[PDB]
Amino acid sequence: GNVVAILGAQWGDEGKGKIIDMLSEYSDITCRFNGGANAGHTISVNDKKYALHLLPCGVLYDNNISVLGNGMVIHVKSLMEEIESVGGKLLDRLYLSNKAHILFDIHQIIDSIQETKKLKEGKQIGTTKRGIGPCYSTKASRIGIRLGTLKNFENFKNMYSKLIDHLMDLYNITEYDKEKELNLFYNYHIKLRDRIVDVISFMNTNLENNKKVLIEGANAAMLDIDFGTYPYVTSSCTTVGGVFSGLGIHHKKLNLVVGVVKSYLTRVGCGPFLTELNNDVGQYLREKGHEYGTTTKRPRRCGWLDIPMLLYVKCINSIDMINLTKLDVLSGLEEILLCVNFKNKKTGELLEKGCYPVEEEISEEYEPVYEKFSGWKEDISTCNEFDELPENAKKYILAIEKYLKTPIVWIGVGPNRKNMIVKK
Amino acid sequence: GNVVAILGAQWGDEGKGKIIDMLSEYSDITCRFNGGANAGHTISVNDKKYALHLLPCGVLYDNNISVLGNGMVIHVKSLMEEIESVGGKLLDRLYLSNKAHILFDIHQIIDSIQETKKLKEGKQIGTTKRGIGPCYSTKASRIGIRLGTLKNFENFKNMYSKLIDHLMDLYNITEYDKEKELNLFYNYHIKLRDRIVDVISFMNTNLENNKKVLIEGANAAMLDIDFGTYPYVTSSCTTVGGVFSGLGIHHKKLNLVVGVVKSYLTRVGCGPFLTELNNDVGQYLREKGHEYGTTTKRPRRCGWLDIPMLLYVKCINSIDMINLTKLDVLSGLEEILLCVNFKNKKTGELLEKGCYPVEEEISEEYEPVYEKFSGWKEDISTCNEFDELPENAKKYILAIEKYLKTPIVWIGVGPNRKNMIVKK
Ligand SMILES: Nc1nc2c(ncn2[C@@H]2O[C@H](COP(=O)(O)OP(=O)(O)O)[C@@H](O)[C@H]2O)c(=O)[nH]1
Ligand SMILES: Nc1nc2c(ncn2[C@@H]2O[C@H](COP(=O)(O)OP(=O)(O)O)[C@@H](O)[C@H]2O)c(=O)[nH]1
Ligand SMILES: O=P(O)(O)OC[C@H]1O[C@@H](n2cnc3c(OP(=O)(O)O)ncnc32)[C@H](O)[C@@H]1O
Ligand SMILES: O=P(O)(O)OC[C@H]1O[C@@H](n2cnc3c(OP(=O)(O)O)ncnc32)[C@H](O)[C@@H]1O
Ligand SMILES: O=CN(O)CC(=O)O
Ligand SMILES: O=CN(O)CC(=O)O
Ligand SMILES: [Mg+2]
Ligand SMILES: [Mg+2]
């Protein structure tokens, strides 16, 4: 338990920021390794909420060290804002990978241009419009500018101009205020240059010094560029392989993987959602659990828990233990449905376990098979122990553990750091 | 040793195809998981050479199963050619990921367009012009077409047209024969559709059935999009994290990692090369070891072995054992230089161990520090045992093991499958 990875097993917003903040009480380093500001991780202490998009969620601890890995696409403008918002001496314990890619405002513009075009074609992805996809695209084309370059403003200014001019031409972006963004980056250069370091060595050194590292996942498994519901996914690797490729440490350094699983499902953006509840039950889940995008404020689509999805994710990420979150939101429902299988509406055959119809046109052929679970009316946000929970909640929890053959260690019963039940 | 990954630790062409073919004698499945046809893996049996670019190098065994993972960008046209070239009943044991991206001819066109533009700017990468970068770019933008779609020709044809029209407009490609490529893909559809399957489940099932899996790396660590000498790198993850993200299996499934290290260095394409020998010694290495691109036929740049590079790669990929290749090529040199450190020419300070100046402008400031090793004149391509090798060769080998704190298990003394010494 010296090197722990927290990975969402669904379509994000499973409660990653919450467990990171909680576990950061006993961790030395907390790292982000993929995506960028599309991520929205909410921390809540005594009901005072804090939302992070680029900095890891261990920032509330004066001693915690924040690390942004090489696998990220960083909107430096947003980064600076979060840094100053945290304040204190955060900079003295901030380590920004000199290999991470810089996400400029033009990346966001292209993101919107692409989405606008697709909207007219009726195939928009519903991205967060934070320019994530376009930044990973320039990374692939290898014209993206990485953080290390920002350490030398002279060289940076020159490279910056060429990338922007190239992109403006490529996407016909007629006007972009290069002078304004450039001057802003000078400020970024001044305040961040000494914090742009070799995270590879920093990680190896600290691991050798027996430091405890918390790896914060962004987005989630079903949004993985490769394994998610393509094209309705993010453009980075959000799965376990990404912990190594996005941070610069090898597989033997990872001690365990915590899968963050919400008691019910949500996804925000377009794409398939087999157990989607576009009715009053969905409204109940969204309102009681206030399911609105931490980043875009968009209303999240809600639905029932999906077991086949989790078996698929277990194959991909491996899951040592589960953090079952927002169980408290299900309080009040007379019945809870658990999707334990998918049946093909055309052939009548059941979907093979471990398989998942990620493709929109294949998903369409499946019908969910539900197991009925009696609900509970008690407010469980006050429960401190597993045994204190009403019986019907226990059965739900136990049923989940059984089907996934994975232990549920942390039960979430509220957005606050304290609202967590530990199942010894 | 049930699940083994073979990863090049330098800039490719370390002899991966050779060890894959060798080890495939005792493996059930051999998988490719990254890149595409930019890779050129040479197999040699009784001096008859075979070069693969997309199919794994286990194809010479009538019982071996070939797997192409989700993380690849596949030029289907080239794939079909290699399939038919192998012949036999290869199709009955070919498993193509339905998640892998299809690389069209237009991807190659864009690759050349981009390189031509950069050439005029004096910053060409020197890509293999196989359209790899542009295909990973369309993957990131999520408009790329994946193999699964090819199973339904009706749907494929329609999606194909839209991607090509979009790209033609984007890059002003005025003429592209859509009808010709389309009709060719119909043929691909017919002969490959039933082989386009769920590799995720196939892998999990076979691993559960105790099948022995060989994971064939493409390109190499120093060409890794994140960890390599950016922008002079390939656009896929060529490191260990990529084995998981490109194949759909988790980190606990990997039993060991073999690092393929050439006795000297080569790289083909532009970019930094600290120990480069652009002189007669370089010519000796290139001619004796016939260092010409397996894919492009371009002459490979040659230089001395680089220890700091390997310590860096060990941090990234982890190395359980090393396959030191082409030691036979060094026969005849009066002296062999091993780069054991890098000294900053400006400050006079030594580069920290485990660190590597990947950036062109930072690399420029370093000077290699060499350790002199006496050479040997004997032809060692006949040596069958480690003890049979001349003493000076042993010292070189032993010196390498010592500095990397990693055992050298397989010594290559010839291009043929048999030309391998096992160091018990
Ligand atoms: N009621 C309730 N809310 C929770 C619980 N855990 C987290 N939340 C809240 O649920 C929301 C999840 O959204 P978000 O923070 O974007 O998820 P993340 O991306 O995984 O960090 C946040 O507003 C959290 O404060 C829980 O156990 N119960
Ligand atoms: N002399 C010699 N040649 C070798 C040895 N191992 C491999 N080769 C040859 O070296 C070349 C390496 O190029 P390539 O096949 O592209 O490397 P790969 O990408 O790692 O498979 C090939 O032509 C091999 O046949 C060895 O031990 N000695
Ligand atoms: O190109 P993008 O901007 O990444 O959009 C692609 C798709 O992915 C969704 N998405 C991306 N990051 C997400 C997130 O992250 P966290 O759990 O870390 O807070 N939580 C929920 N949904 C998320 C977007 O809504 C869209 O459908
Ligand atoms: O966009 P790309 O076409 O990938 O080019 C980017 C850079 O990477 C090099 N390169 C790519 N794959 C390579 C390879 O693979 P294997 O060891 O698998 O045979 N061996 C050697 N060099 C290789 C190219 O020459 C270029 O410098
Ligand atoms: O927490 C982030 N999301 O839920 C995504 C969004 O806000 O769109
Ligand atoms: O084996 C492939 N290479 O060496 C790359 C090339 O041919 O350019
Ligand atoms: Mg979120
Ligand atoms: Mg090669």
- Measured CA to CA in angstroms, residue B242 lies from A207, B23, B70, B130, B392 at distances of 22, 21, 11, 20, 37
Q: Which of B70, B137, B252 lies at the smallest CB-CB distance from A140? A: B137
- Which strands form B335-344's sheet, in the order they lie side by side? B305-306, B335-344, B366-374
Which chain A residue has the Cα nearest residue B170?
Answer: A170
* A242 Cβ inside 6 Å of ligand 1: no
If you count them, how many residues does chain A have?
Answer: 424
Q: Which domain holds residue B383?
A: 261-424
**Inter-chain CB proximity A227 and B244 less than 8 Å:** no
- Under 8 Å between Cβ of B295 and B39: yes
In this structure, what are the phi and psi dihedrals at residue B382, rounded to the nearest 5 degrees? -100, -15
The bound ligand whose nearest atom lies closest to the alpha carbon of B296 is 6
Distance from chain centroid for Cα B117? 26
Q: Which of B260, B289, B240 is nearest to B408 (CA)?
A: B260
Q: How far is the CA of A290 from the centre of ligand 1 (A)?
A: 9
- Whether A128 has a binding-site annotation, put simply, is yes
> B226: which chain A residues are within 8 Å (Cβ-Cβ)?
70-71, 99, 245-246, 248
> A170: which chain B residues are within 8 Å (Cβ-Cβ)?
170
Which chain A residue has the Cα nearest residue B121?
Answer: A162
Write the DSSP symbol of residue A151. Answer: G
Is B280 annotated as catalytic? no
Query: Given CA atoms B310, B314, B317, B323 in this order, what sign does their dihedral have?
Result: positive
* A15 Cβ inside 6 Å of ligand 5: no
Residues A329, A401 within the same domain: yes
Cβ-Cβ contacts under 8 Å for A172 (sequence gap 6 or more) = none
Distance from chain centroid for Cα A175? 33
Task: Give dist(CA B410, CA A342) in Å, integer.
Answer: 48
> A152: which chain B residues are within 8 Å (Cβ-Cβ)?
361
Distance from chain centroid for Cα B389? 29
Residues A119, A104 within the same domain: yes
- Looking at ligand 4, which atom is closest to the CA of residue B8? 17
- Whether A402 has a binding-site annotation, put simply, is no
Residues B377, B358 within the same domain: yes
Cβ-Cβ contacts under 8 Å for A252 (sequence gap 6 or more) = B318
User: Binding site for substrate: which residues of B?
Assistant: 294-300
Which SS3 state, helix, strand or coil, does residue B327 take?
Answer: helix
- Under 8 Å between Cβ of B108 and B38: no
We report the CATH number of the domain holding residue A325 as 3.90.170.10
**Inter-chain CB proximity A99 and B226 less than 8 Å:** yes
**Which amino acid is residue B229, in one-letter code?**
T
Smallest Cα distance from B288 to chain A, Å: 34
Smallest Cα distance from A227 to chain B, Å: 8
Q: Partners of B44 in the beta sheet?
A: B49
Task: Give dist(CA B286, CA B278) in Å, integer.
Answer: 11
**Inter-chain CB proximity B355 and A200 less than 8 Å:** yes
Distance from chain centroid for Cα B215? 11
Which residue reads 């009316």 in tokens?
A377
Beta-sheet pairing, B321-325 with B256-262 = parallel
Which SS3 state, helix, strand or coil, does residue B4 take?
Answer: strand
* Planar angle of CA A201, A207, A213, nearest 5 degrees: 110
Q: Partners of A67 in the beta sheet?
A: A31, A95
- Measured CA to CA in angstroms, residue A166 lies from A143, A275, B58 at distances of 10, 44, 43
Residues B254, B375 within the same domain: no
Residue nearest to atom 18 of ligand 1 (CA): A13
Q: Which of A224, A191, A206, A227 is nearest to A31 (CA)?
A: A206
- Under 8 Å between Cβ of B371 and B337: yes
> A196: which chain B residues are within 8 Å (Cβ-Cβ)?
none
**Which amino acid is residue B104, in one-letter code?**
F
Residue A157: Cβ within 10 Å count: 14
Residues B66, B130 within the same domain: no
Q: How far is the CA of A72 from the centre of ligand 3 (A)?
A: 14
**Inter-chain CB proximity A241 and B239 less than 8 Å:** no
Residues A118, A188 within the same domain: yes
- Looking at ligand 4, which atom is closest to the CA of residue B217? 18
Which chain A residue has the Cα nearest residue B142?
Answer: A231
Task: Give dist(CA B222, CA B228) in Å, integer.
Answer: 4
Q: Which of B273, B410, B244 is nearest to B339 (CA)?
A: B273
Q: Which of A102, A104, A84 is nearest to A94 (CA)?
A: A84
Out of A174, A195, A216, pick the residue that ends a domain: A195
- Under 8 Å between Cβ of A341 and A308: yes
Which chain B residue has the Cα nearest residue A198?
Answer: B355
Element (DSSP H or E) covering residue A45: strand A41-45
The bound ligand whose nearest atom lies closest to the alpha carbon of A12 is 3
We report the CATH number of the domain holding residue A104 as 1.10.300.10
* B6 Cβ inside 6 Å of ligand 4: no
Q: How far is the CA of B397 from the centre of ligand 2 (A)?
A: 18
We report the CATH number of the domain holding residue A4 as 3.40.440.10
> B162: which chain A residues are within 8 Å (Cβ-Cβ)?
121
- Whether A234 has a binding-site annotation, put simply, is yes
> A155: which chain B residues are within 8 Å (Cβ-Cβ)?
361
Residue A109: Cβ within 10 Å count: 18
Beta-carbon pairs below 8 A across chains A and B:
168
- Whether A354 has a binding-site annotation, put simply, is no
The bound ligand whose nearest atom lies closest to the alpha carbon of A14 is 1
Residue B403 in tokens: 């500095």
Residues A152, A186 within the same domain: yes
- Looking at ligand 6, which atom is closest to the CA of residue B294? 1
Which SS3 state, helix, strand or coil, does residue B21 take?
Answer: helix
Interface probe for B, chosen from A142, A161, A351 (most Cβ of B below 10 Å), is: A142
In this structure, what are the phi and psi dihedrals at residue B364, rounded to the nearest 5 degrees? -50, -30
Residues A334, A418 within the same domain: yes
Task: Give dist(CA A93, CA A326) in Å, integer.
Answer: 32
- Measured CA to CA in angstroms, residue B359 lies from A401, B9, B231 at distances of 48, 18, 8
Helices (H) and strands (E) in chain A, counts: 12, 19
Q: Which of A113, A98, A107 is nearest to A147 (CA)?
A: A98
Q: How far is the CA of B355 from the centre of ligand 6 (A)?
A: 27
Q: Partners of B31 in the beta sheet?
A: B67, B215
Q: Which of B192, B265, B194, B257 is nearest to B229 (CA)?
A: B265
Which residue reads 């197999």 in tokens?
B43
Question: Which residues sit with their C-beta closer than 6 Å to ligand 6?
Answer: B 12-13, 40, 128, 268, 293-296, 298
Which residue reads 């386009």 in tokens?
B196
Residues B315, B358 within the same domain: yes
In this structure, what are the phi and psi dihedrals at residue A67, rounded to the nearest 5 degrees? -130, 130
Interface probe for A, chosen from B250, B311, B365 (most Cβ of A below 10 Å), is: B250
Burial class (CB in 10 A: 0-12, 13-18, 19+), B105: middle
Interface probe for B, chosen from A118, A170, A208, A251 (most Cβ of B below 10 Å), is: A251
Which residue reads 């194959």 in tokens?
A315
- Under 8 Å between Cβ of A64 and A30: yes
The pocket of ion ligand 7, defined by CB under 5 A, consists of: A 13, 40, 294
Residues A290, A183 within the same domain: no
- Under 8 Å between Cβ of B343 and B306: no
Q: Which of A136, A148, A312 lies at the smallest CB-CB distance from B359? A: A148
- Measured CA to CA in angstroms, residue B188 lies from A321, A377, B108, B194 at distances of 43, 58, 19, 11
Number of structural domains, chain B? 3
Residues A356, A268 within the same domain: yes
Out of B223, B244, B260, pick the residue that ends a domain: B260
Question: Which residues sit with their C-beta closer than 6 Å to ligand 3?
Answer: A 8, 11-13, 38-41, 125-128, 130, 132-133, 218-220, 223, 232, 234-235, 268-269, 294
**Inter-chain CB proximity B99 and A155 less than 8 Å:** no
In this structure, what are the phi and psi dihedrals at residue B367, rounded to the nearest 5 degrees? -120, 130
Cβ-Cβ contacts under 8 Å for B115 (sequence gap 6 or more) = B124, B125, B126, B127, B129
Cβ-Cβ contacts under 8 Å for A196 (sequence gap 6 or more) = A96, A97, A98, A147, A148, A150, A151
Which residue reads 């049923």 in tokens?
A399
Which SS3 state, helix, strand or coil, does residue B292 take?
Answer: strand
Write the DSSP symbol of residue A293. Answer: -
- Under 8 Å between Cβ of B308 and B280: no
Q: Which of A258, A265, A231, A233 is nearest to A243 (CA)?
A: A258
Interface probe for B, chosen from A107, A200, A234, A355 (most Cβ of B below 10 Å), is: A200
Catalytic residue among B21, B28, B41, B107: B41
Smallest Cα distance from B184 to chain A, Å: 24
> A358: which chain B residues are within 8 Å (Cβ-Cβ)?
99
Out of A209, A231, A260, pick the residue that ends a domain: A260
In this structure, what are the phi and psi dihedrals at residue A45, rounded to the nearest 5 degrees? -130, 120
Whether residue B231 has a cis bond before it, omega within 30° of 0: yes
Residues A345, A400 within the same domain: yes
Element (DSSP H or E) covering residue A392: helix A391-404
Which residue reads 């909410």 in tokens?
A42
Is B101 annotated as catalytic? no
The bound ligand whose nearest atom lies closest to the alpha carbon of A57 is 1
> A227: which chain B residues are within 8 Å (Cβ-Cβ)?
70, 99, 200, 248
Task: Give dist(CA A189, CA A192) in Å, integer.
Answer: 5
The secondary structure of chain B in percent helix, strand, coil, rounded to multiples of 5, reads: 40, 20, 40
Distance from chain centroid for Cα B274? 21
**Inter-chain CB proximity A316 and B200 less than 8 Å:** yes
**Inter-chain CB proximity B148 and A359 less than 8 Å:** yes
